[PDB]
Amino acid sequence: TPIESHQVEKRKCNTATCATQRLANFLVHSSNNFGAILSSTNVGSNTYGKRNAVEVLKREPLNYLPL
């Protein structure tokens, strides 16, 4: 009589979603440069600092208070 097949497959990462995952690796892949990058923050390229997020929140506490 016949017997169930033993076919096996995998779920390789071949989708766009996986692409985002590589972005996370970029932070660690460029973590060393990040240090030297913040050093020249006074080069007029500090208009994208992450801390800006915590600042704007302070300037606009309305969003924090009940709405």
From Swiss-Prot:
Propeptide: 1-9, 52-67
Disulfides per UniProt: C13-C18
Domain of life: Eukaryota
PTM remark: Amyloid fibrils are degraded by insulin-degrading enzyme IDE.
Single Gene Ontology MF annotation: hormone activity
One CC-aspect GO term: extracellular space
Annotated positions of the Tyrosine amide modification: Y48
Keyword Secreted: yes
Subcellular localization, as worded in the UniProt entry: Secreted
The keyword Secreted is annotated on this UniProt entry: yes
Biological process terms in GO annotation: amylin receptor 1 signaling pathway; amylin receptor 2 signaling pathway; amylin receptor 3 signaling pathway; amylin receptor signaling pathway; apoptotic process; bone resorption; cell-cell signaling; eating behavior
Keyword line: Amidation, Amyloid, Cleavage on pair of basic residues, Disulfide bond, Hormone, Secreted, Signal
Family: Belongs to the calcitonin family.
Domain-related comment: The mature protein is largely unstructured in the absence of a cognate ligand, and has a strong tendency to form fibrillar aggregates. Homodimerization may be the first step of amyloid formation.
Other known facts: IAPP is the peptide subunit of amyloid found in pancreatic islets of type 2 diabetic patients and in insulinomas.
Quaternary structure and partners: Can form homodimers. Interacts with IDE and INS. Interaction with INS inhibits homodimerization and fibril formation.
Purpose: Amylin/IAPP is a glucoregulatory peptide hormone that plays an important role in the regulation of energy homeostasis. Selectively inhibits insulin-stimulated glucose utilization and glycogen deposition in muscle, while not affecting adipocyte glucose metabolism. IAPP function is mediated by the CALCR-RAMPs (AMYRs) receptor complexes. Amylin can also bind CALCR receptor in the absence of RAMPs, although it is more selective for AMYRs.
Name the UniProt record assigns to this protein: Islet amyloid polypeptide
